[PDB]
Paper text:
Volume-regulated anion channels (VRACs) are expressed widely in vertebrate cell types where they mediate the efflux of Cl- and organic solutes required for cell volume regulation. 8C-8A(IL125) consists of a 25-amino acid sequence unique to the first intracellular loop, IL1, of LRRC8A inserted into the corresponding region of LRRC8C. Like native VRAC/LRRC8 channels, 8C-8A(IL125) chimeras are activated strongly by cell swelling and low intracellular ionic strength. We demonstrate that the 8C-8A(IL125) chimeric channel is a large-pore seven-subunit heptamer, like homologous pannexin channels.
We obtained five distinct 3D classes for the 8C-8A(IL125) chimera. The most apparent difference between the structures is in the arrangement of the LRRDs. In class 1, all seven LRRDs are arranged circularly with roughly sevenfold symmetry. When the ICD and TMD are viewed from the cytoplasm, 8C-8A(IL125) subunits are organized into two distinct groups, one with four subunits and the other with three subunits. These two groups of subunits associate via a loose interface, while the subunits within each group associate via a tight interface. In two of the subunits in the class 1 structure, K51 points toward the pore, while D50 points in the opposite direction. In the five other subunits, D50 points toward the pore, and K51 is oriented toward the subunit interface. When K51 points toward the pore, it creates a groove between the subunits. These grooves, located between the subunits forming the loose interface in the class 1 structure, connect the space within the ECD to the membrane-facing surface of the TMD. When D50 points toward the pore, the side chain of K51 occupies this space, closing the groove.
Residue numbers in the entry:
A (entry chain F): 16 to 59, 95 to 177, 231 to 405
B (entry chain E), D (entry chain C): 16 to 59, 95 to 176, 231 to 405
C (entry chain D): 15 to 59, 95 to 177, 234 to 405
E (entry chain B): 16 to 59, 95 to 175, 231 to 405
F (entry chain A): 16 to 59, 95 to 176, 234 to 405
The structure:
């Protein structure tokens, strides 16, 4: 699968998002099962007060003040969480499933798998007709892959745009979610004009799930902040190391085959992406990139 | 399997349809557990007001004003969404199963898959079993090129389905935008029940009126994106005569300057595949020249 | 299962329609007994309310007395009728698999075609083993004496579609006739005064504006169903299903002596070539004395 | 595969029984969900009557009049439906699963199945292993004829079973038709609870009275059809000698003119097997002539 | 393959046991669903009586008179029927899983299954088949030596049947004794005067007319079960099952050197011959020394 | 699951545990379905008595007296039943899944299953490579087990824990069975907020819990009796030393040695299921049989 093409920052978030999502789901459930606002008329030994209100006047007051007193944030806290998590997940898996930049990844993975474990690699890095035929076919495949992928830049622009979009969505969320968080309170006042229906004008209301939504909001800000720090680090990683230019220096130094060229653009990007998992697949691919090795295979074929 | 024949617009529209179904199901789920209407009579220190009504008269009033005061759009918003999503699903994946129509596509897919990995293409672009495989490839290519060139059964149907989807777009957006303002919270109910209840005018509240409005806005936006994608698909479909294909670049980049020009359904399929990866075309075009057949026969000896 | 190739497109279409009809019927029945089925109030023929002075059980007495005295019989038993009609359709669609007289012949035919479809001699004849081919030929010979003796496997297939068409016509008739009798507000005039004190009541049927909509849907479905059946009723009449003629195979193979079969074998070939038009081609070679002449020559 | 020995009636009655069972189960299911009875006292502008009764005295009245005024049929109809259906199913099944009467059936089925695929059967109608298998099957059939052609234990039980089922039909139809008129909607209840409630006469409504009646009618219909088929069986076992079979058609057609006429259990079972496909009879008949055995012996020597 | 060692009576008994179980679960479920007792105070135009009792004093009275007036049989009838059914089931199967009486059964059944597919039996009534027959003969001798002195596979059968019969007698006894105490309306005289104000109440038990019918049905079913078990108990004792004579097989096969088995093996043969009286002949063929001498002669 | 390595003791105790769990679940289900307390005030022609209490003062009274008047046994009986049956099951099952005492069990079962059907047993009591392999695996397993302990002490240690737990359960169930009453009195000091100080309460599941407690006591008693008999059976001879004596006279072989420790322990256990596996194993325990097999192989 696409496990080799995923640094830590691209799997770490792959869990954070999930966590975020479940919070949202929990909220939604608890917003439906649990009760809601409860409102009582205000009058601005001990004996109780008689309001002389029915069982439907109370429901009318409750469901009028629910939407005439509560701030829009308190009413819909978790739906925004679900929307944001869904958009984040859509961002994380954009260039994997987009045609025009998906076949290249599949071909690269297939060729890397083929060349990772080859007898010719063992023979070449140490210092039959079938093996020689397979080796020659794989060299031709590598050459055609190089000429077919070493011209475009689609697998880098998409990734840059993706990270930029995730970072900006971070900034917006931490902006507004932090702005509107003191408006989730417990006891509110409701001043609606229902005087000819119930006989009372001012009410005091208690929102049930206020404290819990406040706690969940703080947890969500924390998780988002971690997400944003990870994304910022990735964005720094992209824009510092000149990711569109590879350099086979260490392979040349500790291999002895001093003719490996420096590939650029998309292939260099993919090499930089695959050496963050296990820095040896670059060696195996570099084996199949020297005219010297091709000449030695031709000579041994005879 | 079939992912190769599904361009980006198709998957984009499928995701939009999935989201549409999700919001429809969300609305349907909420309507059962929360939605209701509460109606009170109108009479046009602080003390309460006595109406002197039972628990049966209140239910009478509620369920009468529900169906005599609410606009039909507010009552059944999400069922329309579900029906439209169902129609959109039916329109998609419809040009696969109207006739059998599976042999014509699976045969082409298998042909292309076996042609892509044929070493003969690589050798031209640079044992007995290889010769037998090449002979079978040529024979089945000939059979399929003879079968396909019969008419238009997998091209016009695509046009019909896209046109139907666009028409459904226009209608849905039109009447969802027209009536989106009939979802209100507080309404006035004027029913003539005075000889059994005593009150004539009532004021009612619909529980879910600030949420159906937002779900409607989200649904309308998703609809608009869907329609824009469909319009682009139609523009691309009708801008280029996809029933005729020319191997202009293949002959120049390969040197075999005798490859013919195929048309109708086969050309349509070739253009369909050209979007995913413009490499299968050359691999198939390798097995389309009689000179290649002559070379294969000569080398098999 | 095994009896899958013996289903033209309209058969699976009608199966899907029938299952959808059953879903609608069960949905309606479930929604029926899920809520309060009626709300009835007495009638008395600044603003202040009216005190009926009725207990909590007198209201239930009134509700369920007027429910079965003011509602039209259609508004109550709609889902039950939907279920009954769907079950009848499903039973009718399969009254040619379970009858032993037709089941035996169908199993024999399917076994013969299964044996013939994977016989190398068919490929040999079409391109232009041994004892098994001869034995299969005698099996085919016996087969086209066992079945070709009358009209049993075909008479019931044309007898059932007529019944289905009649049922669809009757359903349309009495379901469009009585769709406007499902009202929302009704008047109930029962004589319960020594128990309650009120004689005239006004009632609301809660799910009256729902059964209406479902009804429409139901009609539409049967309408489509009807059309399909009509096509099949037309498909069995323009061409004589009891006469078959091997013509294209003769020209595409050259074995120009295959005869024209009649009766149930002809009908079965007609009904099975619409699934995959090659079973007739594969079977055709097992019908000519030339094929057996070549078999005997090859054996010697 | 105990389906070859099942004429059309023995498979029609099974579906009838399933339908009867589902009707009974549906009725028994709604027997509990819906509230049973509603009783109010009788006093033998417009204002209501103040009964001045609690919610406990109402329950007392309802649950006393329920069992002091309703007829036993109106209360126990579904249970009787289920009991009768279970008895019918048990009677239909008391033919395969009785020791001393099940081994013969399986032996016959296995022998007939093996004989249906012997190539000597088709050979006689125009290899060492095949020859010895044919000889062994000849001996097995000869032994079997000496096994189940002495006692009619497998034929008397079928007649007993069908007679009992007909009797049950008669009883069920009789009493259901007699009592179906006692399921009423509105009833009167005259119980002596005056020192506890203050009222002596009550009027009650039985909610599930217009429904059971309908189901009851349906039940009869199904049962009626059931009985008819059983009656047909008690004309098919008695219009000829069911214990004397005649292999006349096989001799007059195939040519083998020495096949014997079996009798008793074997004749009855052949008459039954000849109600599915008249080809098993001749496949078994061909393995009953000494001429065929002599021909096989000559071919073996 | 235990069905062969399962006479007809031990199928009918299993069916009766499952019927008893379904009746019991039926009763328990409908006991859960209902509302149980309803109690009202007694005062030992028409106007209703005001008892001036709260909504919790009714619950107090109802549940006090429940376990102060109802008989112990009317409350725990379903539990008793379930317990009896479980004991019956665990009693009928206590000779398959008890160690020391299970290995013998599996050995015997496996051997009898092996000694059915043998052409030597057909010959009575080639090197590999001869060796297989000799091995089977050696096995016959060895286990016939094995299960010949430990005669515990038939005492357990008699003991379980006796236990079942005794349990039948007890159940019938106290079910007939206490079936007239399931009454509908009862009088409850509890001393609660300073908490409710009333001293005497009259109560109705909801499930007083369904339990009577279920009790009668249970009595009928258990009576049939007991009659079957009584017949089986008579069967085991009118003749010694510990001795078997192979008279008919000897007279029919002319191998008249067959000895008479005894004790446990005689019991197993007596049990098996009542399913299909043919395995005895196969074992008779495969237990004689004449047959093995003939086999040895043929082998050479 | 190792049926042969289970005697009547194990099967009977497993069935008893199943029944125990059944009644425990039944009681817990009824408690969670229909079980509560109903309390009324006390005043220490017939007419009704007015308490003048709301619909929430009753809830308050019921909740307060459900915690100050009901004994902790009356409320938590099914939970204790479930916990104790669970621990019994775990203790009885904690003998095969120990990391280090499992392979010796299934390997022994496989060896004996192979030895049961070996033709050499038939030949002796009346394929050479297979017989040699079986002899080899047998002798290596003997060497491995004769020095490997922690397969006999664990059995005793688990069957002693069951006995002690039985004793404790009897102890605290017999004493607190008379505290499950139906009618109880509740004297809580809530007068300024309810108006009454003394209440009489009914617990709705007193009699049923009494019956279930009696059934539980009987079932434990039987379980403990069986466990005591098992302990007696283990502790009256050297279960770790088996004597191959009758084999010599009833087989003819005179060179059958007596195995030591855990292997003798399993031999003693498996002898009761069927006293014939010892025969098949003793056939292969002779050092002359291997010599005869080697001679016959040539």
């Amino acid at each position: 699968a696409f496990r080799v093409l995923k640094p830590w920052w691209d799997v770490f978030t792959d869990y954070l998002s999930v966590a975020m999502l479940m919070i949202g789901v929990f909220g939604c459930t608890l917003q439906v099962m649990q009760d809601k606002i409860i409102c009582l008329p205000k009058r601005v030994e001990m004996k109780g007060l008689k309001t002389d209100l029915d069982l439907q006047q109370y429901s009318f007051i409750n469901q009028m003040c629910y939407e005439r007193a509560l701030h829009w944030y308190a009413k819909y806290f978790p739906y925004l969480v679900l929307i944001h998590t869904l958009v984040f997940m859509l961002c994380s898996n954009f260039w994997f499933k987009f045609p025009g930049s998906s076949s290249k990844i599949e071909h690269f993975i297939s060729i890397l798998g083929k060349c990772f474990d080859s007898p010719w690699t063992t023979r070449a890095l140490s210092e039959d007709k079938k093996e020689g035929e397979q080796a020659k076919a794989l060299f031709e495949k590598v050459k055609k892959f190089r000429l077919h992928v070493e011209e475009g830049d689609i697998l880098y622009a998409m990734y840059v745009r993706q990270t930029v979009l995730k970072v900006i969505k971070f900034l917006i969320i931490i902006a507004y979610n932090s702005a509107l968080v003191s408006k989730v309170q417990f006891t509110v006042d409701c001043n609606v004009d229902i005087q000819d229906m119930t006989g009372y004008k001012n009410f005091s209301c208690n929102h049930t799930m206020a404290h819990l939504f406040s706690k969940l909001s703080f947890c969500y800000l924390c998780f988002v902040s971690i997400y944003g720090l990870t994304c910022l680090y990735t964005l720094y990683w992209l824009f510092y190391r000149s990711l569109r230019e590879y350099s086979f220096e260490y392979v040349r130094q500790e291999t002895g085959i001093d003719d490996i060229p420096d590939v650029k653009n998309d292939f260099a990007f993919m090499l930089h992406m695959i050496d963050q998992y296990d820095p040896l697949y670059s060696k195996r691919f570099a084996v199949f990139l020297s005219e010297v090795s091709e000449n030695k295979l031709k000579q041994l074929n005879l």
